[PDB]
Structure formats: C-alpha cells, structure tokens
RNA sequence: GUAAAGCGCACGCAGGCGGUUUGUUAAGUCAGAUGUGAAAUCCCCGGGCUCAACCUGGGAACUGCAUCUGAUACUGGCAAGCUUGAGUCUCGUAGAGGGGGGUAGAAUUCCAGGUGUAGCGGUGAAAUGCGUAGAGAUCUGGAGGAAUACCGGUGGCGAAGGCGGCCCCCUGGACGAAGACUGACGCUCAGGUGCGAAAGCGUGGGGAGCAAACAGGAUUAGAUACCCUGGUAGUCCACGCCGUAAACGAUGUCGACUUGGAGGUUGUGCCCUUGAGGCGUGGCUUCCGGAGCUAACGCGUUAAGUCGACCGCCUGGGGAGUAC
C-alpha cells in the first residue's frame, strides 16, 4: 500500500481468504518475506515463493482445513502512526498462547514463543491468529 | 463417453459464482460443466447410497419438477422407495407432525372412507368426499408408507427447491443433490455438478441410483 | 497554451540529450514557459476563475519540483533559477 | 419552476421507467 | 448516510505518515550491566501485643532516570542506486468546463399603419382594471430587454457553486494507444490563501416580462393571506462587497484488497469489424443483489465490506448557533 506495505499484505491474506482463494499475490519485500517464513512454518499457510527481478511479487498459497480458514484473524499492531515496541517480558500472548505473534527482534523477525525463549524483545509486527 | 460425456450444460449467462470451478469455461454463450470431474462424486455417492441401503436406507427422491415427476415415481417404485414427484409442500421436513397426522388422514381415507360410504350416513355426500380427497391422496403419493424421518435425501436440483435443502441441512439429513449450474451449491451436502434439464440425463442419473439402491443391502 | 516546437526546444536545450523530457529541470522550465505565457491571458480576462485553478496547479507543481532539485542536487538548482530568473 | 423540472424528469423516471 | 457529529469546495506552508535494494550510523528500539529511585506506606514470608486493629524484621516492589557495553530486524539519519508510486513529452477522443466577442429566430411587451368592430379581460361567481376615441381580434411593420423551444437523455462536463441557441478568439482540465524520460520528486494538511446558488449592499447604466413592498377588487367571522387588477426595489449589465444554503450522495481526501448480472456514455486492440458488431481492454457511469457490515432501513468493487495515512467534527433536549 501507499503508506503501510505490511498491513497491506495482511489485508491481502484476510481478504483473499474470506473469498476462499487458494493463493494470493503481492509485491514482495524483505520484511514481507521475513514474515512469510514465520507464517508458513507455524503452519498458518502452506508455502510461498517469491519471484521477479524488477517487480519481485510475493505469492502466498493460502491454507484452509475445512471451508473454514486456518488463519482466523491477523491484526496489524505496529502501525506507522503508532509504532509499538515491546520488551522481552511484556511480549503479548495471542489467545493465551494458542495463536502466534510476529515481532522484529534484534536477531531478526520471529514468533514470540521463540523470542521469549531467546530473551530478547522487539517491535510488534502483527498478531497472527 | 458415458452419461457425463453425453449431457453438457445449462446456464447461458445468469451464472452463480459459488460453483465457479465446476465449469470448463463457457462456449457458445452457455457454460459447460467439468463433465469428467463429475464421476469422482458419482461413484462416491453411489458407494454411500449402497452403504445406506445396507442400513436399509430411508431415502427421498425429490421430483418437484414437471418432467422428472413421473420420471421419478417410476424410480421410487422401481426403487421400492419414496419420492415427492410433486410440489415440495412447505415444510415436509420440519413440520413433520403435521404431515404425520395428514398421513393418518390419508390412511383413514383408504380405510374408512371406503367404510363410510358403505352404510354410515349418506351415499352421495360420502362419494363427494371420496372424489375430493382422492386428490388429497394424489398429493403426498411418495412419503405415504412409513413413519417419516428418512435417512438421506436425493433431490434432483437446487434452485427449484432451495427450501428442501434449507430444511434438510437445518435438520441434518445428507442432501444428495444434482446441482444445476444456475443453482446455489453452498447449502447442499454431496453436490453433483450435473445438468438438471434434458430429461434424458435425469433419467440416466436416477437409473444409476436405482441400480445402486435396489441391492445396496448386499 | 504552448506549441509542439515551443516545447521541443525546451526539451532540446534543457534536456541532457534529445528526449530527456523527464529530468526535473526540463519539467520546471517547460512549466515556467507555460506560466509566463498565461500571465498575458489572465491579465486580459480577470474573471476566468476556471483557468486560474490550472495556473495555480502548475505553479504549485513547479515549486514542488524545485524543492526536489534543492534537496537532491543543489548545483543544478542554483544554476537553473538564474537561467530562468526563478525563485525570486 | 427552474428547479423542479429537473427533479420530476429525474423522479418520474421512477414513475415511467417500469 | 438517517440517532449529536464530514468544514460549501479546493490549494497549500508548518506538522503527521511514507515504495524498494545495498552500504553506513546506531539516534528510536532491544538485551545486559552499573549507579540511583529517602524512610514510612502497598504486597510477601514472618515475629510481638491473650486475637485483631496496631507495632515490627527481612524480602519483594518503587513499573523511573542517568551512564556504560553489545545487537542491528524494524523506525530515523547520511550515501548510492532501482522502477512499481508521482510527474514531463509524442498522439489523438469527448464534453451545456470557463472567460471575451458577435449573431439568428420564435415569444411576451410597447409604438406606428390598415381593415372594421362593443366588448376585452378575470375567477369558484366579481369588481378594480382596459376600452366605443377603436380596445380585444387580425395581418403589416418598427423598438427594447430578457431567456434559448425541438435534440434532451436515468445524458455530458466541473473542486464545488454551477454550466444548455449558433459561430469564432483565449483557455482549463480529463481520458485513451503505444512508447520514451526523471528517479520517491509522494498522501494529508491546523493556521493561511482563493473560488463561494439566491437574496442583500455600494456607485453608475438599463429595464421586455416577472415581481417582495405598496395600491385597488373579491373571499372570509375576520384576511394585514391564499385569489384578481395594477406594481416599485430587485431580476439584467460593469466594477466593488457580502459570505451564507436541505451549499445534500445529509457519505473528508488518498491508497490496497474482496463473488456476480443488466444497462449508459466515451476511447481503443484484435476478428470475415463483411456489419450493426464478435472476441477483449480502458475510463466515467445508473440499477439489482449473497458474502460482509448496519439498530434498522440499507450499503453492497463508485461500500456504509476488509485494512492503512492524515485532517474536520460529536459527546442528553432546551437555553443556543444565543450573549459577550
């Protein structure tokens, strides 16, 4: 999007899933791909692949275990306009741990299970659930 | 090469995008169903019908449309089974106690309406009641045998009787529909991307279903 | 307004080569050519308000390209606005 | 009317359209 | 949107946000550490008052600040780019988009002429009115002012207000076909600036109809109203002001995503365009409609859906958009 290229991808993921699409496409980033790894390895989505040189477009292959989607509700938290940063202990829990958060830690982007084990807080990218 | 490779499609331009994938892609201003992809949910429905008949399937042959009507009554009889070859009377599933008393009334017609005209009060008035409520028994021709609550359901369309599926899913009965392409397949249970017109086709479908159900008891 | 050759010469001398319409100084001087032409119009009518909207639109885009010159490369800025007399 | 006639010709298009 | 609440509309400084790759810094951020965060209060495990309130030991806590050492993903800086964001050029398409000039004819009115004549008008009946002089009616002309029948449309254009005869002069946008070129040049914008229907005002013209005000005639219980006969300001023009509207899609601008159908208007690509078009692709546009949203009606790819960036406003009715 013109001012939030990451809430834009999240909106892609949970618009193209109300419509029940198999796969969605968007112009990729480095942070977009860094997220996509954390999504696709916590099983929130099948697998992705980025492709393109002048216009490297990210395409996620959405997942769903029934008519229901596996991704219930992703929430963009650290909006440009209100940047949200947390410490290693005040890291949010999503659905009391059932769902995943995505934070930008000094050692990269990861979940909060792993960034709470790693003892290193971050920048709350989005709640994944 | 078979039935699937014989009937093609429907739905010139007023199409329903809920069953988007079921079509190859429209040719000659009409949509064409993925006819080859229909047999994997032919044989599965056939196998489950065999299983249900093994449990003595209580299975409906909903035939509300004009042409399939006698084309299905023949089936249920050759199916030794039930049907509704006429209008889906509003609530023949949810309002079951009503039709329960109604079939009591019809059994009364076939037992005592003969007995009433015999000697009870009048000759001619009882004959009038006979010639009128024979139309009542003409209604409800299929369901008339057993206590109700059929195991499953084999409606032959969706749009024409969206109320039928709307009641069977609200009650939890497996709808074995043969969706048109004009229809709204979100409600059905075992949707079959077939073509509901071309009475030849529906006769073929019901003949296959009859062949399955007549010995699903193994 | 402005003619095809009138814009052609601007693209010619103010572009780094032929068909360098896009460089910001070509755009700036082409816009200022058009503005200088239209002052003679708007001094005649004074009741044409549905054209001072366009004149203001291009004066605003000229200032917006000029600030971009200023940040991106100062030397071209300070060599242009005297070739034009611009940034009074 | 100077303002109705553009309204009836844009209302009765509810009357006489169907 | 309709409950209170989107400025009338734009432009725009400050401000707020910012595509993408690499390098750098390490300010935000994060981790650790060091000091400090008075005591009592608060909490915890105690202890002593016969219990408790109360007193009390030790801890925890004081969610802060400052300094130091690491990380470097994200945000910021600085540098180098990139092309998708935004903009220039080639090229055409449409249009009541503006501004300035003329110009035509019908129509009301007035004036002059001819013919000849007793009514004309007016309403629910009526008089005031106009007229025997020549009215009405008719045709013949002439003056003036104001608007542009038909096309015309659920049409089109414009930021809104708004813009309809025709032709020219200047001009503003928009959209579409391929291209080329800059390289983030962007979005929003408190204040600010400018446009702002109609009334209204100022100074000079003009003034056909129409007509607040004002006269006279009916109505009514009364009529200062509806109704009729006159009718001035105004309506028109130039310059200046006013700044408001139910200025309304009662929907701020910008961007991204998300099933379908039928129309409309304007480009264009391919197809025997044979043609009308078929197959496509753009833009703008009106009407249905499940998802979804809504209190609801309803909206529904032009959202009131799912998100993001900014701005404006709301916080029971009255008093009051009033006093100062």
- Assess whether B177 and B105 both reside in one domain: no
Q: Total domain count for chain C? A: 1
Expt. technique: cryo-EM
Check whether residue A16 has its CB closer than 7 Å to nucleic acid strand E: yes
Long-range contacts of B145-150 (CB under 8 A, 24+ apart): B145/B82, B146/B58, B146/B82, B147/B100, B148/B96, B148/B99, B148/B100, B149/B58, B149/B96, B150/B58, B150/B59, B150/B60, B150/B82
- Assess whether B114 and B65 both reside in one domain: no
Separation of alpha carbons C9 and C16, rounded Å: 13
Check whether residue C1 has its CB closer than 7 Å to nucleic acid strand E: yes
* Length A52 CA → E103 C1' (Å): 65
- Assess whether B78 and B94 both reside in one domain: no
Separation of alpha carbons B72 and B169, rounded Å: 23
Is residue B147 domain-resident? no
**Neighbors of chain B by Cβ distance (3+ pairs < 8 Å):** none
* Closest C-alpha to B93, from B8, B175, B216: B175
Contact between residue B184 and residue B20 where contact means Cβ atoms under 8 Å apart: no
Check whether residue A2 has its CB closer than 7 Å to nucleic acid strand E: yes
Both ends of chain C: CA-CA distance in Å? 24
- Assess whether B80 and B34 both reside in one domain: yes
How is chain B classified by DSSP, letter by letter? --GGGT--EE-SS---GGG-TTBS--BTTBEEB-GGGGTHHHHHHHHHHHHHHHT---EE-B--SHHHHHHHHHHHHHTTS--B-S---TTTTTTHHHHHHHHHHHHHHHHHHHHIIIIIS-SHHHHHHHHHHHHHHHTTTTTTSS-S--SEE--S-SGGGHHHHHHHHHHT--B-----SSS-TTS-SS-----S-SHHHHHHHHHHHHHHHTTTT-
* Closest C-alpha to B155, from B181, B173, B182, B136: B173
Q: What are phi and psi of B115, to 5 degrees?
A: -75, -35
- Assess whether B171 and B193 both reside in one domain: yes
Separation of alpha carbons B170 and B147, rounded Å: 20
Is residue B5 domain-resident? no
Q: List beta partners, residue A105.
A: A108
Nucleotide closest to residue A34 (CA–C1'): E73
Check whether residue A68 has its CB closer than 7 Å to nucleic acid strand E: no
Is residue B10 domain-resident? no
Tokens 């009937």 locate to B7
For residue B134, the enclosing domain spans 89-140
Check whether residue C28 has its CB closer than 7 Å to nucleic acid strand E: no
Distances (CA, A) of C49 to B12, B215, C46, C57: 53, 88, 8, 13
Give every CB contact of residue A103 below 8 A, 6+ residues apart in sequence: A86, A91, A109, A110, A111, A112, A115, A121, A122, A123, A124, A125
Q: Which nucleotides of E are covered by protein (CB under 7 A)?
A: 10-13, 16-22, 28-32, 70-75, 82-85, 87-91, 97-100, 153-154, 158-161, 170-173, 180-187, 194-196, 239-240, 254-262, 279, 291-292, 305-310
Domain boundaries, chain A: 1-71, 72-129
* Length C4 CA → E91 C1' (Å): 12
- Assess whether B50 and B101 both reside in one domain: no
- Assess whether B76 and B161 both reside in one domain: yes
Is residue B2 domain-resident? no
Q: Total domain count for chain B? A: 2
Strands of the sheet containing A100-105, edge to edge, are A75-76, A124-128, A100-105, A108-110
- Assess whether B35 and B81 both reside in one domain: yes
For residue C61, the enclosing domain spans 1-88
Resolution given for this structure, in angstroms: 3.0
The helix, strand and coil proportions of chain A, stated in percent and rounded to the nearest 5, come to: 20, 30, 50
Check whether residue A118 has its CB closer than 7 Å to nucleic acid strand E: no
- Assess whether B77 and B166 both reside in one domain: yes
* Closest C-alpha to B96, from B58, B140, B148: B148
- C10 Rama sector, left if φ>0, alpha if ψ -120 to 50, beta otherwise: alpha
Nucleotide closest to residue A24 (CA–C1'): E257
- Assess whether B127 and B93 both reside in one domain: yes
Nucleotide closest to residue C50 (CA–C1'): E98
**Neighbors of chain D by Cβ distance (3+ pairs < 8 Å):** none
Nucleotide closest to residue C19 (CA–C1'): E181
């Amino acid at each position: 999007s013109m001012q939030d290229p990451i809430a834009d991808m999240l909106t892609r993921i949970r618009n193209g899933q109300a419509a029940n699409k198999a796969a969605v496409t968007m112009p990729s980033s480095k942070l977009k791909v860094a997220i996509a790894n954390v999504l696709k390895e916590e099983g929130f989505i099948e697998d992705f692949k980025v492709e393109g040189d002048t216009k490297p477009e990210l395409e996620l292959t959405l997942k769903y275990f029934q008519g229901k989607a596996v991704v219930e509700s992703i929430q963009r938290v650290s909006r440009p306009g209100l940047r949200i940063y947390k410490r290693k202990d005040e890291l949010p829990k999503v659905m009391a741990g059932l769902g995943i958060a995505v934070v930008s830690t000094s050692k990269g982007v990861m979940t909060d299970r792993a960034a709470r084990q790693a003892g290193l807080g971050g920048e709350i990218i989005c709640y994944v659930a | 090469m078979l039935k699937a490779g014989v009937h093609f499609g429907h739905q010139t331009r007023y199409w329903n995008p809920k069953m988007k994938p079921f079509i190859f892609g429209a040719r000659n201003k009409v949509h064409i169903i993925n006819l080859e992809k229909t047999v994997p949910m032919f044989n599965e429905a056939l196998a489950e019908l065999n299983k249900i008949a093994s449990r003595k399937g209580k299975i409906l042959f909903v035939g509300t449309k004009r042409a399939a009507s006698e084309a299905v009554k023949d089936a249920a009889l050759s199916c030794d089974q039930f049907f509704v070859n006429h209008r889906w009377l509003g609530g023949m599933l949810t309002n079951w106690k009503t039709v329960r008393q109604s079939i009591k009334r019809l059994k009364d017609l076939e037992t005592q309406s003969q007995d009433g005209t015999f000697d009870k009060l009048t000759k001619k008035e009882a004959l009038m009641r006979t010639r009128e409520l024979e139309k009542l028994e003409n209604s409800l021709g299929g369901i008339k045998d057993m206590g109700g609550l059929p195991d499953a359901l084999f409606v032959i369309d969706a749009d024409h009787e969206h109320i039928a599926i709307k009641e069977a899913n609200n009650l939890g009965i497996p709808v074995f529909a043969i969706v048109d392409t004009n229809s709204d397949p979100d409600g059905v249970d075992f949707v079959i991307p077939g073509n509901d017109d071309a009475i030849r086709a529906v006769t073929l479908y019901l003949g296959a279903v009859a062949a399955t159900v007549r010995e699903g008891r193994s | 307004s402005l003619s095809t050759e009138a814009t052609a010469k601007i693209v010619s001398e103010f572009g780094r080569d032929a068909n360098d319409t896009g460089s910001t100084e070509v755009q700036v001087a082409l816009l200022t050519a058009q503005i200088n032409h239209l002052q003679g119009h708007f001094a005649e009518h004074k009741k044409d308000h549905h054209s001072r909207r366009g004149l203001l639109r291009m004066v605003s885009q000229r200032r917006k390209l000029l600030d971009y010159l200023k940040r991106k490369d100062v030397a071209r800025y300070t060599r242009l606005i005297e070739r034009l007399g611009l940034r009074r | 009317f100077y303002e109705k006639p553009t309204t009836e010709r844009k209302r009765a298009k509810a009357s006489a359209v169907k």
